[PDB]
Design an enzyme around this catalytic site. Structure first.
Site, PDB file in Angstrom:
ATOM      1  N   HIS A 127       0.785  -1.238   0.000  1.00 47.96           N
ATOM      2  CA  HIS A 127       0.000   0.000   0.000  1.00 47.96           C
ATOM      3  C   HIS A 127       0.827   1.305   0.000  1.00 47.96           C
ATOM      4  O   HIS A 127       0.268   2.405   0.035  1.00 47.96           O
ATOM      5  CB  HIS A 127      -0.928   0.042   1.218  1.00 47.96           C
ATOM      6  CG  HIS A 127      -1.977  -1.048   1.421  1.00 47.96           C
ATOM      7  ND1 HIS A 127      -3.302  -0.992   1.239  1.00 47.96           N
ATOM      8  CD2 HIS A 127      -1.693  -2.296   1.913  1.00 47.96           C
ATOM      9  CE1 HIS A 127      -3.821  -2.140   1.603  1.00 47.96           C
ATOM     10  NE2 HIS A 127      -2.839  -2.899   2.000  1.00 47.96           N
ATOM     11  N   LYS A 155     -15.604   7.571  -2.073  1.00 49.20           N
ATOM     12  CA  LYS A 155     -16.795   7.798  -1.265  1.00 49.20           C
ATOM     13  C   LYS A 155     -17.410   9.093  -1.703  1.00 49.20           C
ATOM     14  O   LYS A 155     -18.589   9.097  -2.022  1.00 49.20           O
ATOM     15  CB  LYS A 155     -16.457   7.863   0.238  1.00 49.20           C
ATOM     16  CG  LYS A 155     -16.143   6.479   0.796  1.00 49.20           C
ATOM     17  CD  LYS A 155     -14.863   6.171   1.595  1.00 49.20           C
ATOM     18  CE  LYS A 155     -14.777   6.613   3.040  1.00 49.20           C
ATOM     19  NZ  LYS A 155     -13.701   5.816   3.612  1.00 49.20           N
ATOM     20  N   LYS A 212      -8.767  14.315   5.633  1.00 48.38           N
ATOM     21  CA  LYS A 212      -7.606  13.468   5.400  1.00 48.38           C
ATOM     22  C   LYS A 212      -6.752  13.657   6.661  1.00 48.38           C
ATOM     23  O   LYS A 212      -7.051  14.496   7.523  1.00 48.38           O
ATOM     24  CB  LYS A 212      -6.747  13.937   4.222  1.00 48.38           C
ATOM     25  CG  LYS A 212      -7.266  13.817   2.810  1.00 48.38           C
ATOM     26  CD  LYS A 212      -6.706  12.553   2.164  1.00 48.38           C
ATOM     27  CE  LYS A 212      -7.457  12.298   0.850  1.00 48.38           C
ATOM     28  NZ  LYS A 212      -6.834  11.330  -0.050  1.00 48.38           N
ATOM     29  N   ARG A 213      -5.697  12.834   6.802  1.00 48.74           N
ATOM     30  CA  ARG A 213      -4.699  12.939   7.860  1.00 48.74           C
ATOM     31  C   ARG A 213      -4.097  14.325   7.767  1.00 48.74           C
ATOM     32  O   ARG A 213      -3.661  14.702   6.672  1.00 48.74           O
ATOM     33  CB  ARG A 213      -3.508  12.046   7.690  1.00 48.74           C
ATOM     34  CG  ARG A 213      -3.695  10.593   7.525  1.00 48.74           C
ATOM     35  CD  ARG A 213      -2.245  10.070   7.230  1.00 48.74           C
ATOM     36  NE  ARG A 213      -2.079   9.451   5.940  1.00 48.74           N
ATOM     37  CZ  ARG A 213      -2.759   8.330   5.633  1.00 48.74           C
ATOM     38  NH1 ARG A 213      -3.633   7.733   6.489  1.00 48.74           N
ATOM     39  NH2 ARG A 213      -2.578   7.764   4.428  1.00 48.74           N
ATOM     40  N   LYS A 253      -0.313  16.064   2.124  1.00 48.89           N
ATOM     41  CA  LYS A 253      -1.749  16.162   1.888  1.00 48.89           C
ATOM     42  C   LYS A 253      -2.173  17.568   1.538  1.00 48.89           C
ATOM     43  O   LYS A 253      -3.276  17.833   1.078  1.00 48.89           O
ATOM     44  CB  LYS A 253      -2.532  15.767   3.127  1.00 48.89           C
ATOM     45  CG  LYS A 253      -2.282  14.382   3.660  1.00 48.89           C
ATOM     46  CD  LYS A 253      -2.885  13.438   2.670  1.00 48.89           C
ATOM     47  CE  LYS A 253      -2.751  12.089   3.268  1.00 48.89           C
ATOM     48  NZ  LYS A 253      -3.249  11.140   2.302  1.00 48.89           N
ATOM     49  N   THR A 313      -9.373   5.834  -0.996  1.00 48.01           N
ATOM     50  CA  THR A 313     -10.742   5.344  -0.881  1.00 48.01           C
ATOM     51  C   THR A 313     -11.769   6.416  -0.528  1.00 48.01           C
ATOM     52  O   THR A 313     -12.925   6.343  -0.950  1.00 48.01           O
ATOM     53  CB  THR A 313     -10.738   4.219   0.154  1.00 48.01           C
ATOM     54  OG1 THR A 313      -9.916   4.674   1.223  1.00 48.01           O
ATOM     55  CG2 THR A 313     -10.149   2.911  -0.357  1.00 48.01           C
TER      56      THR A 313
END
Ligand SMILES: Nc1ncnc2c1ncn2[C@@H]1O[C@H](COP(=O)(O)O)[C@@H](O)[C@H]1O
Ligand SMILES: *Cc1c(COP(=O)(O)OP(=O)(O)O)cnc(C)c1O
Lengths: 791, 70
Positions: free
Chosen positions: A332, A635, A523-524, A529, A631
């Site tokens: 991953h 969504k 998100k984190r 990011k 993911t």
């Protein structure tokens, strides 16, 4: 037990009094939640027993999904949806004067996962059950999740999480099936084989939780282990602490205890009979499939080998053969950087048997690359499992490729990169192992559950079969110009936007304008990011609104949410900046409800279910090159949100499904970041060319946003100006050009909604039922089945 | 000692602050200095570390892209 309001109410009452030993006079909301949870759990268990019986009759290949985190969320409503019970539970409960939404809100999310890796394994357990596959998810039973974030004055307090403090009505402790796991010890190589002697033992107790397939009556098993200890006080704390060296201990705990279950179940195959018969391990890979989800359960390979050679006395080659045919590895990462490497010193204290086996595997494996490419001695150095240099480390991913028969990535490009760059020599030696399996989300928790209104209108046109065949969503392209569907899709999002605003009031005490396009980024909180590119843009909206406080602006609520890793200073500072822009912006009388910036505290699966339904825009802005999947992205797509993003991870395959035309893609692409790295990234150029940017960093370092401590954001300003690894300033101009385009589209409701119908129709590729049917056919050797069972 | 009796070289405080306001971009030097190019090449190529070729690539990336002390 019937799904008929009368027996539901009858059983609600039997559980509150007889199960809970509570009473209408002392019961609390919570007590009433457990009586509901136990009423429903009855129905889940009826189906669980007949499924499981059925696997013993059929003797299918069983898939074991080992994972060191499952991001389960809250079981009650997912159980009700998958078992068609939610309305009867809503009648029953309101006929007793209880309101189900109130009660559902008492359940704690299971503290079993931290993030995407966990939510993947959790969505896979929904689709494996819905696809009728004989699957088991095995993991640790963590008494505490990874904190609960609390915002106290713009700073994150990590509050602790005993999600189990009042019991869990959904699991079943199995004291009778406690197994041992051994640690430490010495290896005595006797006459007839090796023996791992003098070991410290820890007990591993099973806890069973059922997972429902959507309306097919198949309920499978998630089985998590608890550590129990059998100077002894210290010898019991660290034992009991499994729930540095402790992670290697936790990883082997889940591996050792699960494999005992696998070999026991293999052997005691006969329906009814609990004795063995399968003594010949030649059928073992036809019956068992172990899916190593990222390197964390990788000791499953030297462990399986240890059992078959040492204890079952099968010889090394035969046992090796069983092992590679039984295992598979999902990767991953994109970064060489993040791979687990365990120093051999820790491994020879803790697992001296398994280091023997890892070195034997590496001797044989390296002898195979030697004949395959003679001469080549640096290839040897490169492919080895022991990495020498300063500290000698075992490279766990090279153990997984050596011992698995399929290694895969979670997105087309990533998986290409594993061949092309990261595991290039392994691709050259055994090209056939490499595969790709693009992630997915389940259409049940991520659509018919969190968004019954969209599912209702999708179903009034194409029925309900799409929920387990999301590719039928393509029939919606006939309705792109249908004025009734364009109006229904829009009304659903408005009702979802009102619902979430009222939540935000009774939980944030600020009033958001439920007409503003809701711009959502969850998100984190991490630098790759880019929440900071999003801050730079809302400060731009703010300033622009200031300069001409009368020009039209399309109203926006910018919601940003995520956890900051404790210890990460810059992550905690980004959250303080985000909540700080909120104080200035949300109170400034000229703006009004033109702009409003809001940090969503404590983001997790149930909050996700409440925000993604209401979103208009999905911020997917990580620097290109830093992301493999996404993911969340999928969504937002399925739920009627448009994405703004960089060409990377999930955003590539979704632009390509939706039609790029229907996507707000912007900024550098991996080619462009590489050129800027090859040429030197110099943020001072951007700063000097762009006056509107100059203003922001000025505002930031002068104290505009934090007048009480007017140098609070010096860290983020120097980092941006002088050491910004993810090139935020290099995408600022195109980000705000792209955004200007989104607002221009949002000014036109029918054409916004039509772009939305185009997205929803093409979202089918991203259902986890596709991801799992691909795993079953390509890796596991089994065949998906929508055959429903009995009742 | 008298500056003449000393080998003082390089930048002064004023010069490095000037360089920081324009931005230090290490790349500019590398592109214009041939012998430097040959050196970074040798360090990436496992020349000074034959058995482990990529040994020194961490300080190379530092020199090249995150050199805080010029
Ligand atoms: N040999 C068997 N015959 C039929 N049902 C079985 C058998 N072994 C286990 N079961 C069922 O499977 C469930 C889980 O058992 P196990 O798979 O052994 O953990 C039990 O509650 C039984 O319903
Ligand atoms: C969907 C989801 C996830 C996964 O989403 P992310 O895109 O933010 O993470 P990555 O896929 O790894 O990029 C994580 N956490 C929650 C709560 C959730 O709903």
């Amino acid at each position: 037990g019937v799904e008929n309001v009368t027996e539901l109410k009858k059983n609600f009452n039997r559980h509150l009094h007889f199960t809970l030993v509570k009473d209408r006079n002392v019961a609390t909301p919570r007590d009433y939640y457990f009586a509901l949870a136990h009423t429903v759990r009855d129905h889940l268990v009826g189906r669980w027993i007949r499924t499981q019986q059925h696997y013993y009759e059929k003797d299918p290949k069983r898939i074991y999904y080992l994972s060191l985190e499952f991001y389960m969320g809250r079981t009650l409503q997912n159980t009700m949806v998958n078992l068609a019970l939610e309305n009867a539970c809503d009648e029953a409960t309101y006929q007793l004067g209880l309101d189900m939404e109130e009660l559902e809100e008492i359940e704690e999310d299971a503290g079993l996962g931290n993030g995407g890796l966990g939510r993947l394994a959790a969505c896979f357990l929904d689709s494996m059950a819905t696809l009728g596959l004989a699957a088991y998810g095995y993991g640790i039973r963590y008494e505490f999740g990874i904190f609960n974030q609390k915002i106290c004055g713009g700073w994150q307090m990590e509050e602790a999480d005993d999600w189990l403090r009042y019991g869990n009505p959904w699991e079943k402790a199995r004291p009778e099936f406690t197994l041992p796991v051994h640690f430490y010890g010495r290896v005595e190589h006797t006459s007839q084989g090796a023996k791992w002697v003098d070991t410290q033992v820890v007990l591993a107790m099973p806890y069973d939780t059922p997972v429902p397939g959507y309306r097919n009556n198949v309920v499978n098993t998630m089985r998590l282990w608890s550590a129990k200890a059998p100077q002894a006080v210290l010898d019991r704390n660290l034992a009991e602490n499994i729930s540095k060296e402790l992670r290697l201990k936790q990883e082997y705990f889940v591996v050792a205890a699960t494999l005992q279950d696998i070999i026991r179940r293999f052997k005691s195959s006969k329906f009814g009979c609990r004795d063995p018969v399968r003594t010949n391990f030649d059928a073992f890979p036809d019956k068992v499939a172990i899916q190593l989800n990222d390197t964390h359960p990788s000791l499953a390979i030297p462990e399986l080998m240890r059992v078959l050679v040492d204890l079952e006395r099968l010889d090394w080659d035969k046992a090796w053969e069983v092992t590679v045919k039984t295992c598979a590895y999902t990767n991953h990462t994109v970064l060489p950087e993040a791979l687990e490497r365990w120093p051999v010193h820790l491994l020879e204290t803790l697992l001296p048997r398994h280091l023997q086996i890892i070195y034997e595997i590496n001797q044989r494996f390296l002898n195979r690359v030697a004949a395959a490419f003679p001469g080549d001695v640096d290839r040897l150095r490169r492919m080895s499992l022991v990495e020498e240099g300063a500290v000698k480390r075992i490279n766990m991913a090279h153990l997984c490729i050596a011992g698995s028969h399929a290694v895969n990535g979670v997105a087309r490009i990533h998986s290409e990169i594993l061949k092309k760059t990261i595991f290039k020599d392994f691709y050259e030696l055994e090209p056939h192992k490499f595969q790709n399996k693009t992630n997915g989300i389940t259409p049940r928790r991520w659509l018919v559950l969190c968004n019954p209104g969209l599912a209702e209108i999708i179903a009034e046109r194409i029925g309900e079969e799409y929920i387990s065949d999301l590719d039928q969503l393509r029939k919606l392209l006939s309705y792109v110009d249908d004025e009734a569907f364009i109006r229904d899709v829009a009304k659903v999002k408005q009702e979802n936007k009102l619902k979430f605003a009222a939540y935000l009031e009774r939980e944030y005490k600020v009033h958001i304008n439920p007409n503003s396009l809701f711009d959502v980024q969850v998100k984190r909180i991490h630098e790759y990011k880019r929440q900071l590119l999003n801050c730079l843009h809302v400060i731009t909206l703010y300033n622009r609104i200031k300069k001409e406080p009368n020009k039209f602006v399309v109203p926006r609520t910018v919601m940003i949410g995520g956890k900051a890793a404790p210890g990460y200073h810059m992550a905690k500072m980004i959250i303080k900046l985000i909540t700080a822009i909120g104080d200035v912006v949300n109170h400034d009388p000229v703006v009004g409800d033109r702009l409003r910036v809001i940090f969503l505290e404590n983001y997790r699966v149930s909050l996700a279910e409440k925000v993604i339904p209401a979103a208009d825009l999905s911020e997917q802005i990580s620097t290109a090159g830093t992301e493999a999947s996404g993911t969340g992205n999928m969504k937002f797509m399925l739920n009627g949100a448009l994405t703004i993003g960089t060409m990377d991870g999930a955003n590539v395959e979704m632009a390509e499904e939706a039609g790029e035309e229907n996507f707000f893609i912007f900024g550098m692409r991996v080619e462009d970041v590489d050129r800027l790295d090859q040429r030197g990234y110099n943020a001072q150029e951007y700063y000097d060319r762009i006056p509107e940017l100059r203003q922001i960093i000025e505002q930031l370092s002068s104290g505009f946003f934090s007048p009480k401590q007017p140098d609070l954001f010096k860290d983020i300003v120097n980092m941006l100006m002088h050491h910004d690894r993810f090139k935020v300033f290099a995408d600022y101009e195109e980000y705000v050009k792209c955004q200007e385009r989104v607002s221009a589209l949002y000014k036109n409701p029918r054409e916004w909604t039509r772009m939305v119908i185009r997205n929803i129709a093409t979202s089918g590729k991203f259902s986890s039922d596709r991801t799992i049917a691909q795993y079953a056919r390509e890796i596991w050797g089994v065949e998906p089945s929508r055959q429903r069972l009995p009742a």
